[PDB]
Amino acid sequence: PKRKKNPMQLRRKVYGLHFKEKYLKMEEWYYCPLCAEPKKPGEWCRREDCRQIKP
Amino acid sequence: KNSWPEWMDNGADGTGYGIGLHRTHPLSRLRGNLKRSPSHVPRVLGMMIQGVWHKSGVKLYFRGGKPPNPSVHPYLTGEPCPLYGWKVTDESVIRQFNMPSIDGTNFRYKPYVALQ
Amino acid sequence: RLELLESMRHPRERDFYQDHTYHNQWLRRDLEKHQKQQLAARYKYFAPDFEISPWIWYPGDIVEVVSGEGIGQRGTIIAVIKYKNEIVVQNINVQDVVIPASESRPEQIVQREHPISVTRVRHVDPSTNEICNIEMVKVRNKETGEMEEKRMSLESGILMSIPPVNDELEVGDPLKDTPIQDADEATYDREAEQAVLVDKRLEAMEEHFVQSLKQS
Amino acid sequence: YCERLETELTVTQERLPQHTLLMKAVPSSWKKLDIDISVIRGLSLREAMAQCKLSLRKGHQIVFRALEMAQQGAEAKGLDKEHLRVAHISCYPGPTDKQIDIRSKGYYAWK
Amino acid sequence: QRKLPKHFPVVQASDGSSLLREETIACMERERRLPHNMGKLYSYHRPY
Amino acid sequence: IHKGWRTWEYQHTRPDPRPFPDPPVNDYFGRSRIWNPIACKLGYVRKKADEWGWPNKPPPPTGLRHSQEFFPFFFERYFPDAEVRLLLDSVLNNETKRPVFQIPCSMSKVELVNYLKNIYGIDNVVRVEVRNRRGRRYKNEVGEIKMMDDYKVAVVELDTPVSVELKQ
Amino acid sequence: GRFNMDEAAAALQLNPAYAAALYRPLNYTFHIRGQLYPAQKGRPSRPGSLAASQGRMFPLYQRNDRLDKELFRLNSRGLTTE
Amino acid sequence: VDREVLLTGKSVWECPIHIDHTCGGSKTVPPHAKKPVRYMDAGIANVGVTDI
Amino acid sequence: FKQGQGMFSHQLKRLLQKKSIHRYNWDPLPMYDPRKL
Amino acid sequence: YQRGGWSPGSKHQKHMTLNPTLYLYRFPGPHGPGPYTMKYWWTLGCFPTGMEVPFRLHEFLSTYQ
RNA sequence: UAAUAUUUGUUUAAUGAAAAGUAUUUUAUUAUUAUAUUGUAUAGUAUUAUUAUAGUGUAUAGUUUUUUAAAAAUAUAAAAAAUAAAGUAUGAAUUAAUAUCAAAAUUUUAAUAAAAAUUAAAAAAUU
Ligand SMILES: [Zn+2]
């Protein structure tokens, strides 16, 4: 760095899509019909119902 | 030279039996190497911090982590001889605790005095 | 809250020196200054001469509260805490005392009188019922030349006696205690034992003197 | 007059249908925690707890603890669990500890 | 007029004899080390 | 003194030496604490107040001072001072042949046996083992470092196993 | 029908307290310098807790001087020329 | 003692602890010490004055 | 050794500061011994 | 050398031969001392540097008294 | 600067250790053949540093804390091969007169001229 960056340069990084995708992003989920925990589709739990039929 | 006898500088035998600090009851004729004079002040500290490294591979006096007080050692009561490991040259320095008992009204006495 | 403080952090971050310390903690080095100030402000009675000179207030006296809360209230002195310069006055400055729970008991909220500073209370003249400035007087006690000290009200000239210090007489340990008729028996015959002592000092003094004569 | 002012301020803050939890000395930074907070503003308690539960970030874990405890507080206050919402989430700078980072040629700095 | 500064301790008998003053001092000192009265310590560094 | 300093502008007072001396008192209450061999005036003067009144009373003849009857020796012979105390956890409800004593560090193995023989009447003692343990150091709630007195741990080996029973 | 170091020492006449001392470091038996962990050192009693000493929490790692005097340092009566 | 007095209500006359105001420095002073007699001191206190 | 972080060298910087007993031993006269005159 | 304060809390680079300081592991900061040093306060009995004299009077009055 | 560098604990032949001058052993501990007395565990170099210095004495105690799902270029070894970069967590340092910035060209002005004037045509983020 050759100079102190003002609040605008600090604020410029949040307009970027990289920032938004990394930090402020909401996850999509449903309720596991076997466990009733919030769940992302494609990720399962160690429980013998959830291994064979993985809901 | 040294007032204190030479067996407490280097040992009475080869393994350095009798060396260290020795304190004397100051009613007793025999004398120790504990001297608080300025000129002696290095070597007493030299015993308390270092101790001494004997050529026999064993470190005499203080080898550890707890430095010994030369001041509260019990009094020097004798001198070492090779036959019987310690000769008692002076018995009068050992405290003989003696308590008078069952004399007069002494039995009725109790450690505390009562109230009125 | 400590365990959830450690349940919210990451396992990756180590913190060293858990049971030992780089610097030796057994040196006496002073506190940081504001807790020294806490100590001083909390502990004022450790100062020299904090006890007030010829102390007047003794339990049983009737006293007005001059300043602060409860101003203008007359009461009787219940207890004296002398080294703090504090007074407990009957049903003045009564607050709650919390007695915590334990194995057998619940938490109890119990009203109690709390110590008042001596600065803000003044005596009431037992005759005039006015605030009197009390001075401290010596008066020959009856049958006694000791002239023990009483407190006089300057306006009306009334002497107030000092009450006794009566205490727990409920403490005793008969088996282990010597009775008085036992303890007061005189065994000291002094001349005989004095002679013995003196002679055995004499012996040593002479002995060393003749040793001096020898080496001279 | 004054004690009455503070009385009515406390009672107008109290008889309001909300629960305000203040958690102090949270073990995260200001910037990171602000980042992790800004996701959750203006959400249901349901989606708040779910979005806190479903992320890999420290800030979200901390906010989950806060949500759970404030929820217990609000239920102890007599509100309804199913209608709760995060009305206000904010972070402000707290306390600090310092550390020695040792660097070559007799250089040091304070982490 | 004082014969010792106000902040000095009073170590002496009630008669004023200084005969025992070293015993009194020694006693006070061993007592400042470990007061006989002393209740439970709230410190994490505890003698046992 | 190629060039003389201006010394006329100073009033005469001794500056403090910049490598300032630390106070002679020993602040370390740990394990490694050293007894200071150096003797100040105060030691001898307090001796002199203790043994005879030095400020007021006239000194006794040397022959008395150097004799068994001289008061600190007299009082030590006829009024001994030792705290020989017992760790109860050694003698509590277990039978133990080896009770453990705390002892003032100036006692020998012989003096303990003499103590137990003539006072407590403990007549069977096979032998004594001796440790010197530095007194117990603790901090109180203000953080004042305090150190209880140094002691000597004596494991005392008997003939007959000894217990002290606790009624539950 | 396992190993059982005690009955292995009894079969070999190895003094079963010693045989075990072969399989722990020389720090834990003999008086010898060695790496010690400050959590083993022991702790004074807190208000919440009791005292913690290395007598109760580590009996088997403490030093034995039977073995130490019989193995390492010399006997005096072997050398006495008197 | 504060707690116990607050509960039991007993009056306490002498302080339950001894305070060495010299913080262990009075032992440094030699045992025979006494202040010298100072003559004609500066002060207004030896004139007992109640009203000024 | 007085230079170290150890506590022995910490004591020696402090303990060695106190002043020893002083008496004025005024010189002996070995060759003129007044007591034999 | 010395691009920051002469304090032992200050931000930037220091040097040992100019600004000598001893080794303070976790030095409680300018304001509040935080949850880390307090973690140490509630577990090992004092702050990790051993310079901060443990002073608990204020809780002795709270629990034991 | 800095959503940065660093750190990152999934498998041990560090066998040994007097020369360390710091580390609450609550009683670490003989049963001795010997006599009294004294003393045994981790802090060298500002660090729990690259990793110690040296004198013992010995050879089968495996004697038991190193993250990770592409490719360039850097570092080793044989442009192939081995290693490392989106990562969750920790979080420094050089630097900092600045306004949301200063892109391209032309001449001028007291010495590059990011100084002028004129024409002009520089979006945001990340590497
Ligand atoms: Zn499931």
Residue E21 CA, distance from chain mean position = 11
User: Per CA to C1' distance, which residue is closest to K4?
Assistant: A1
Q: How far is the CA of B81 from the C1' of K33 (A)?
A: 17
Q: Are strands C116-117 and C86-89 parallel, antiparallel or unpaired?
A: antiparallel
Q: Flag residues 3-42 of A with CB < 7 Å from strand K.
A: 3-6, 8-10, 12-13, 15-19, 22-23
Q: Are strands B59-60 and A30-31 parallel, antiparallel or unpaired?
A: unpaired
Question: What is the residue-wise DSSP string for E1-48?
Answer: --SS-TTS---S-SS---TTHHHHHHHHHHHHHS-SS------SS---
User: Per CA to C1' distance, which residue is closest to K43?
Assistant: C22
Q: Are strands C108-113 and C116-117 parallel, antiparallel or unpaired?
A: unpaired
Query: What does the block give as tokens for J35?
Result: 């949850």
**CA diameter of chain A:** 60
Cα separation, I17 vs C84, in Å, equals 41
Cα separation, G42 vs J16, in Å, equals 35
Cα separation, H7 vs F5, in Å, equals 72
Cα separation, B100 vs F7, in Å, equals 76
The answer to whether D5 CB is within 7 Å of strand K is no
Q: Compute the residue count for chain G.
A: 82
CA distances from C58 to B58, C34, C78, H13 (A): 72, 37, 9, 10
Q: Which residues of E touch J46 (CB under 8 A)?
A: 44
- Indicate the resolution in Å: 3.4
What one-letter code names the amino acid at D110?
W
Cα separation, G78 vs C56, in Å, equals 83
Q: Are strands F85-86 and F100-103 parallel, antiparallel or unpaired?
A: antiparallel
Cα separation, G72 vs D90, in Å, equals 68
Contact C127, C61 (CB under 8 A): no
What one-letter code names the amino acid at F55?
P
Contact G46, E46 (CB under 8 A): yes
Experimental method: cryo-EM
Q: Compute the residue count for chain J.
A: 65
DSSP letter assigned to residue C140: P
CA-wise closest residue to H9 among C55, C59, C105: C59
Contact H1, E35 (CB under 8 A): no
HEC readout, chain F: CCCCCCCCCCCCCCCCCCCCCCCCCCCECCCCCCCCCCCCHHHHHHHHHHHCCCCCCCCCCHHHHCCCCCHHHHHHHHCCCCCCEECHHHHCCCCECCCEEEECCCCCHHHHHHHHHHCCCCCCCCEEEEEEECCCEEECCCCCEEECCCEEEEEEECCCCECCCCCC
Question: What is the residue-wise DSSP string for chain D?
Answer: -HHHHHHHHHHHHHSSS-------S-SS-HHHHHHHHTTTTT-BHHHHHHHHHT---HHHHHHHHHHHHHHHHHHHTT--STT-B-----------EEEEEEETTTEEEE-
Exposed, middle or buried: residue J32 (CB in 10 Å: 0-12, 13-18, 19+)? middle
Cα separation, F118 vs F121, in Å, equals 5
For B111, phi then psi, to 5°, come to -55, -25
Contact F64, C205 (CB under 8 A): yes
Cα separation, C173 vs C169, in Å, equals 11
First-to-final CA distance of chain B: 67
The answer to whether G71 CB is within 7 Å of strand K is no
CA distances from F142 to G8, J56, J60 (A): 57, 7, 10
Enclosing H/E stretch for C95 = strand C94-99
The answer to whether B84 CB is within 7 Å of strand K is yes
CA distances from E32 to A54, C49, E28, H18 (A): 73, 21, 6, 8
State whether I8 and B49 contact (CB < 8 Å).
yes
Query: What does the block give as tokens for C172?
Result: 């005793």
Q: Flag residues 2-21 of C with CB < 7 Å from strand K.
A: 9-10, 12-13, 16-18, 20-21
Q: What share of chain G is helix, strand, coil (3-state, %, to 5)?
A: 30, 0, 65
Q: Is E30 in the F-facing interface, judged by CB distances under 8 Å?
A: yes
Q: Please indicate if the annotation marks A37 as binding a ligand.
A: no
The set of residues, in sequence order, having a beta carbon less than 8 Å from that of B11 and lying 6+ positions away, is B17, B18, B19, B54, B60
Enclosing H/E stretch for C182 = helix C180-183
Q: Is C82 in the H-facing interface, judged by CB distances under 8 Å?
A: yes
State the Rg of chain J over Cα.
15
Q: How far is the CA of G5 from the C1' of K59 (A)?
A: 23
| b/e code B68-107 from CB counts within 10 Å (16+ = b) | bbbeebbbbbebebeeeeeeeebeebbbebeeeeeeeeee
CA distances from C103 to C89, C100, C107, D90, G58 (A): 34, 10, 11, 43, 34
CA-wise closest residue to C81 among H1, J65, E35: H1
Query: What does the block give as tokens for C71?
Result: 């101003």
